[PDB]
Amino acid sequence: AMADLEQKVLEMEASTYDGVFIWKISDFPRKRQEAVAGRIPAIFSPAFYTSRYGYKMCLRIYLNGDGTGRGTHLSLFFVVMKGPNDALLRWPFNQKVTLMLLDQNNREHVIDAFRPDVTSSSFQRPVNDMNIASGCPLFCPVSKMEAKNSYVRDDAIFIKAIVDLTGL
Amino acid sequence: AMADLEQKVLEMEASTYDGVFIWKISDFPRKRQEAVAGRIPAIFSPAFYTSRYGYKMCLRIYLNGDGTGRGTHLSLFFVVMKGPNDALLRWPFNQKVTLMLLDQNNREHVIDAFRPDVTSSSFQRPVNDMNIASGCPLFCPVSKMEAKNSYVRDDAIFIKAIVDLTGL
Amino acid sequence: AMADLEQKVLEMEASTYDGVFIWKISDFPRKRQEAVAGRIPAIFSPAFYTSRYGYKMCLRIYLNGDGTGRGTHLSLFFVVMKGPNDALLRWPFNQKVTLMLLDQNNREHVIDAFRPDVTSSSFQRPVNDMNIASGCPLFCPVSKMEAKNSYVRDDAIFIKAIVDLTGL
Amino acid sequence: PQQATDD
Amino acid sequence: PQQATDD
């Protein structure tokens, strides 16, 4: 009970309702090793929404890659979650999604984007807490981030997601 | 006193500050019956505001009606609550209020609206936690909602309120 | 325990993310005396932000003055705090700040404004939880507030801060 | 508008 | 702006 309450508070403090989310991942070195060691392959981010009563979403990242990017790339995915208002929303989810690894020097941000594949189970109205994630298995080479550059600063990185609201 | 914290968390979680509120009432069948039995005639909704520091409001519904709508209609009312910033607000409350029972097919919403009666105690600056509720005793015939249609889906209904912000 | 969680909930409840903040200070008479007695010269306000992921700030007030205004004026200051996303923000802080003591008759508000001194330690990127507060030592004569007028009503006052978002 | 009867 | 004296 006490745990769930603290969990609810943490999610509320991180929530946004305009389809824009910035995910600060602290203790990067540690989590990065936990991934490389295979103990904790991926991490989910807190949830965010397209509008006050819009779609509920979150991010999922593999600091040491998944699938095609295993061991070589930072794999970043988008997740459609079961929202409290799904009954009022249009399905399947069909909003363009932009993903970025922010350069803390604010010069060369890693950026990629994709439009949902309406036939995929990843974008149908959620039956479970979360649909299967989809995104970019080869989002960023581990050499580019981790190594040095200005992505990792004071043992932390920032991931930004922008869900296009066109049509919403 | 974890129940007090939980209450605060749930209220914060539900709050909106743009005069637009969507209230999801789950366990519809049960609550509906508790009303018909006369055990729980009405239900108050969480609070919402006209702006970050505007009027504090909530809604009050009677699943089996009140007054002229008792036993035949879904009666829905608006409530002006004692807000933390009432001293900075104009009184009496004089904003138009639109109330809706959302059709989950998003085709035929039940809608009504009213402008405050400036002389009613329902719209004066609150002395107590809440002023007397005011609204629509004949909001929706019980036959229309409850029964079937697409207002009640997966044992839940959605109520929507839009407080006009003209002059604020 | 629940004491730390309750604390976090309290801060969240007071936070804003549009650079506009209204600080209601209750128990005015008491806090006013504590200041005059020299026991508690200042009070810090909850934190607020320029945007969802913008600068973190708070206000600092002296009900019986500070420095040049000690004993004769209400002194009000602005505070730049260490924010979660300071690494993504431009430094030094350079947004215009407007401070107000609200007239609860909504007539004559006490107002002042200033643009940051880019060379002051008060606006450099925070190394500590709070930078040195900077603002208006002679914000308002004690005789103008406390005494009577419509600034103090029902033993409370309202302070308002507006951080210009130009360039943000 | 009409006020509720038992509030 | 002017800085506070005891912070």
CB A123 within 8 A of CB A80: yes
Pick from C10, C17, C25, C70: nearest CA to C160: C25
Torsion of CA C48, C52, C56, C62, to 10 degrees: -10
Measured distance CA(C122)–CA(C116) in Å, rounded:
8
CB C71 within 8 A of CB C38: no
Helix (H, G, I), strand (E, B) or coil at A116: coil
CA distance B7 to chain A (A): 11
Tokens of B2: 């974890």
* A117-to-A95, A167, B132 alpha-carbon distances in Å: 10, 17, 51
**Structure token pair of residue A153:** 């600063």
Cα separation, A31 vs A163, whole angstroms: 26
Q: In angstroms, what CA-CA distances link C18 with B15, B116, B134, C83, C129?
A: 17, 30, 33, 15, 21
With 0-12 / 13-18 / 19 or more C-beta atoms within 10 angstroms meaning exposed / middle / buried, residue C27 is exposed
Taking the Cβ of residue A1 and every Cβ of chain C, the question of whether any pair is shorter than 8 Å is answered with no
Length of chain B: 168
Which residue in A10, A88, A91 has the most chain B C-beta atoms within 10 A of its own C-beta, making it the best mutation to test that interface? A88
User: Which residue among A5, A12, A88 sits closest to B102, beta carbon to beta carbon?
Assistant: A88
Among residues C55, C53, C48, the alpha carbon closest in space to that of C12 is found at C48
Question: Quick check: C154 contacting B, CB < 8 Å?
Answer: yes
**Interface with chain D: mutation pick from B77, B121, B129, B136, highest number of D CBs within 10 Å:** B77
Which one, of B19, B1, B9, lies nearest residue B160 by Cα? B19
Note whether D2 contacts B41, CB cutoff 8 Å: no
| CB contacts < 8 A (A, C) | 29
| CA angle in degrees (0–180, nearest 5) for B109-B114-B115 | 145
> How close, in Å, is residue B17 to chain C by CA atoms?
11
Question: Does residue A37 contact residue A28 with C-beta atoms inside 8 Å?
Answer: no
Count the Cβ atoms, other than its own, within 10 Å of residue A107: 8
* Mutate: best of A18, A23, A24, partner C, most C CBs <10 A: A24
Question: Range of B53's domain?
Answer: 1-168
The Cα-based distances of A33 to A27, A29, A62, B81 in angstroms read: 10, 6, 11, 52
The DSSP bridge pattern shows strands A156-163 and A43-44 to be unpaired
The reply to whether B87 touches chain C by the CB within 8 Å rule is yes
Which of E3, E5, E6 lies at the smallest CB-CB distance from C122?
Answer: E3
From chain E, the residues in CB contact with C78 under 8 A are 1
Q: List Cβ neighbours of B148 (8 Å cut-off, separation of 6 or more).
A: none
When CB atoms are compared, the residue of C66, C97, C114 closest to E4 is: C66
- Residue in chain B closest to D4 (alpha carbons) equals B133
**Binary contact (D1, B114; C-beta < 8 A):** yes
Whether residue A87 lies within 8 A of chain B, CB to CB, comes out as yes
Q: How many CB atoms lie within 10 A of CB B168?
A: 14
Choose from C4, C6, C88 for mutation: most chain A CBs within 10 A. Answer: C88
Residue pair A42/A36 in contact (Cβ under 8 Å)? The answer is no
Residues of B in contact with C2 (CB under 8 A): 1-2, 5
Q: What are phi and psi of C114, to 5 degrees?
A: -160, 155
- Shortest CA gap B58–chain C (Å): 18
Structure tokens of A165?
Answer: 């609201």
Task: Indicate yes or no: CB of C24 within 8 angstroms of CB of B52.
Answer: no
How many contiguous H segments (helices) and E segments (strands) does chain E have? 0, 1
Asked whether the beta carbons of A59 and A45 are under 8 A apart, the reply is yes
3-state SS assignment for residue C87: helix
Interface contact B153-A5, CB threshold 8 A? no
The count of structural domains within chain C is: 1
Nearest by CB to B88, from C6, C18, C102: name it.
C102
Residue of C nearest to B15 (CA): C13
Q: Which two tokens stand for residue C155?
A: 């033993």
Q: How far apart are alpha carbons C76 and C142 in whole angstroms?
A: 12
- C16 touches B: beta carbon within 8 Å: yes
Judge: C62–E4 Cβ closer than 8 Å, yes or no: yes
Residues of A in contact with C84 (CB under 8 A): 24
Provide the phi-psi class of A125: left if phi over 0, else alpha when psi is between -120 and 50, else beta: beta
Residue C92, preceding bond cis, omega within 30 degrees? Answer: yes
CB B151 within 8 A of CB B127: no
Cα C100 from Cα C97, distance rounded (Å):
10
Burial C115-134 (b: 16+ CB within 10 A, else e): ebeeebebbeebeeebbbbb
Amino acid at B30: R
HSE, side-chain direction, 13 A CA sphere, residue C7 = 4
State how far the Cα of C77 lies from the Cα of C43, in Å rounded to an integer: 10
- The residue assigned the tokens 């509320």 is A12
Q: Where are the beta strands (DSSP E) in chain A?
A: 20-26, 43-44, 48-49, 56-62, 73-81, 97-101, 110-114, 134-141, 156-163
Domain harbouring B18, CATH code: 2.60.210.10
Q: Can you tell me the distance from the alpha carbon of C134 to that of C80, in angstroms, rounded to the nearest whole number? A: 9
